[PDB]
Design a protein around this ligand. Structure first.
Ligand code: HEC
Length: 108
């Protein structure tokens, strides 16, 4: 959205051993370490009711889109007060730029 955009770079191989380790963009995703994302971006924070979420994320309504999301992906444990998301942060806008770039795809 605002980033320098990507180019279907190494995004797929990213999520795999980056988010997949926790999550599942798919629908069938029964949920593992984290809730399912799917075609996020546009909704208000978490979008899963069946699965028990956190009282921090849901309590944010951080309308996902592109930059925002990344804004959290980087520092999810700061922005979100009480994020069970044990990610830490990529701190590498480089990948981040590709993350969303591809994410949007994976999400769609
Ligand atoms: C495990 C070490 C994680 C990795 C790697 C990533 N995520 Fe994550 N995410 C994780 C948790 C434990 C949670 C919170 C769930 C809880 O209830 O404990 C999250 C949350 C998300 C969210 C918001 C959903 C929500 O649960 O409220 C998003 C949009 C999200 N995670 C996306 C996502 C992406 C795209 C990642 C790879 C770049 C990723 N996460 C990594 C755990 C883990």
């Amino acid at each position: 959205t605002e980033f320098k955009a990507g180019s279907a770079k190494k995004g797929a191989t990213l999520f795999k051993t980056r988010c997949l380790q926790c999550h599942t963009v798919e629908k069938g995703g029964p949920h593992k370490v984290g809730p399912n994302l799917h075609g996020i971006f546009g909704r208000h924070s978490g979008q899963a009711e069946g699965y028990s979420y956190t009282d921090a994320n849901i309590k944010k309504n951080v309308l996902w889109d592109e930059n925002n999301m990344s804004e959290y992906l980087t520092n999810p444990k700061k922005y979100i007060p009480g994020t069970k998301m044990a990610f830490g942060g990529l701190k590498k806008e480089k990948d981040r730029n590709d993350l969303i770039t591809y994410l949007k795809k994976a999400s769609e």
